Design a protein around this ligand. Structure first.
Ligand SMILES: [Zn+2]
Length: 130
């Protein structure tokens, strides 16, 4: 990943939750994150490197307990990786710029659009109102 890893800096800047989620692939509990029900127009950026990841227009009501989007901003900004942790087989999503853990993508999304549910930790993101 191109964005330079600087852990001491990350630990100074990121909150405990932001750090654990993005660097240790922790998961914010459902219905506890800042952006779960956010509907404001704007752009969701990687909390680590600042790259634009998701638009508000791609955000939808999943009822799952995390920010959820049916597509990322383009096909290059997300890295996908198989995830075998926690007794499950899933598809992890990461920031392609810095490698931050963002969440998981599932095939139960909007049937009338992409059919994809990008399920993202609020603590992996920072919202730019726009
Ligand atoms: Zn990033």
């Amino acid at each position: 990943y191109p964005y330079p890893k600087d852990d001491a800096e990350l630990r100074r800047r990121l909150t405990p939750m932001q750090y654990e989620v993005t660097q240790h692939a922790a998961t914010e509990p459902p219905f506890t994150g800042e952006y779960t029900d956010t509907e404001d127009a704007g752009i969701y950026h990687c909390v680590v490197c600042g790259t634009a990841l998701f638009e508000s227009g791609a955000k939808y009501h999943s009822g799952c307990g995390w920010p959820s989007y049916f597509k990322p901003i383009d096909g290059e900004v997300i890295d996908e990786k198989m995830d075998y942790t926690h007794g499950m087989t899933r598809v992890e999503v990461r920031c392609n710029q810095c490698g931050a853990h963002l969440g998981h993508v599932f095939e139960d999304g909007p049937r009338d659009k992409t059919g994809l549910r990008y399920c993202i930790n609020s603590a992996a993101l920072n919202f730019e109102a726009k």
